[PDB]
């Protein structure tokens, strides 16, 4: 199983209601492990996974000081962006940043990611080479030139290849009981008079990656079920009495043999 660490950082302005709200959420694969929220009483990073009880007070203090500095970087860059786009104060605006690393099943680095969005569309993103930038509009073309001159990409590349990978290795080991487990899906089919709708359900599985096929198709994005497992359904509309010709297939890391059901 390959693994990833990813952070999701968002600031959103709320003019006349106070300063922008800053939130940072960290994930290993699809497990949330830390979270900062500027609207909490006593904003700090807090653990959301049991393996993060291993880290000491120095770890929490240092990443909470990063969040306090990062909050101000998002608030000033929101205010810069209003002037770049000649926008009035008073409108709601959003700055997003997603970044992280992917490793193979042997732990070696597969790729890194740094991507920014203003008001929910691309702004600037670092290419797969971890060296050059893709600017999505006229403002981002100016940032790209300034960031090429300042060598921004070198600071991100050092993080993505070093710190990001080294912490992801530490979290996979400290949380191996949660993160390296395999919970195989429990599947069933439901029958809905309509035509007729056949719905193949997969419940109780871990990790989230799955394939559901009917042998066209309604489905939902794989979704968290509230206790750290995932679920998914896929449906087909079939002819009103000949539904035993149809077969639901499920592929998962915990099924050496895929399930077949009807």
């Amino acid at each position: 199983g390959p693994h990833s660490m990813r952070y999701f950082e968002t600031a959103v302005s709320r003019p006349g209601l106070g300063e922008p709200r800053y939130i940072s959420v960290g994930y290993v694969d699809n497990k949330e492990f830390v979270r900062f929220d500027s609207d909490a009483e006593n904003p700090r990073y807090e653990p959301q996974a049991p393996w993060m009880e291993q880290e000491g007070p120095e770890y929490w203090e240092r990443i909470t000081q990063i969040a306090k500095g990062q909050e101000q970087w998002f608030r000033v860059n929101l205010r810069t962006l209003l002037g770049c786009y000649n926008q009035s104060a008073g409108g709601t605006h959003t700055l997003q940043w997603m970044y992280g690393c992917d490793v193979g099943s042997d732990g070696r680095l597969l790729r890194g990611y740094e991507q920014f969005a203003y008001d929910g569309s691309d702004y600037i993103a670092l290419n797969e080479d971890l060296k050059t930038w893709t600017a999505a509009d006229m403002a981002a073309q100016i940032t790209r030139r300034k960031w090429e001159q300042a060598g921004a990409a070198e600071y991100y590349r050092a993080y993505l290849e070093g710190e990001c990978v080294e912490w992801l290795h530490r979290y996979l080991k400290n949380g191996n009981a949660t993160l390296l487990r395999t919970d195989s899906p429990k599947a069933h089919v439901t029958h809905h008079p309509r035509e007729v709708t056949l719905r193949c359900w997969a419940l109780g599985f871990y990790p989230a990656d799955i394939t559901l096929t009917w042998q066209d198709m309604e489905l939902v994005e794989t979704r968290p079920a509230g206790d750290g497992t995932f679920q998914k359904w896929a449906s087909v509309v079939v002819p009103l009495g000949k539904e035993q010709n149809y077969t639901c297939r499920v592929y998962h890391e915990g099924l050496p043999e895929p399930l077949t059901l009807r």
């Binding site: 952070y7 950082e9 940072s24 960290g26 830390v34 770890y59 990443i63 990063i66 969040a67 500095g69 990062q70 970087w73 000033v76 860059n77 810069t80 962006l81 002037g83 770049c84 970044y99 702004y123 600037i124 403002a139 981002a140 100016i142 940032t143 300034k146 960031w147 300042a150 921004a152 600071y155 991100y156 993080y159 710190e163 990001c164 912490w167």
Partner: peptide, 15 residues
């Protein structure tokens, strides 16, 4: 472990 504080601002005013 998150990324450190972003070193550079967007600076998208132009001339």
């Amino acid at each position: 472990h998150p990324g450190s504080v972003n070193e550079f601002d967007f600076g998208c005013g132009g001339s």
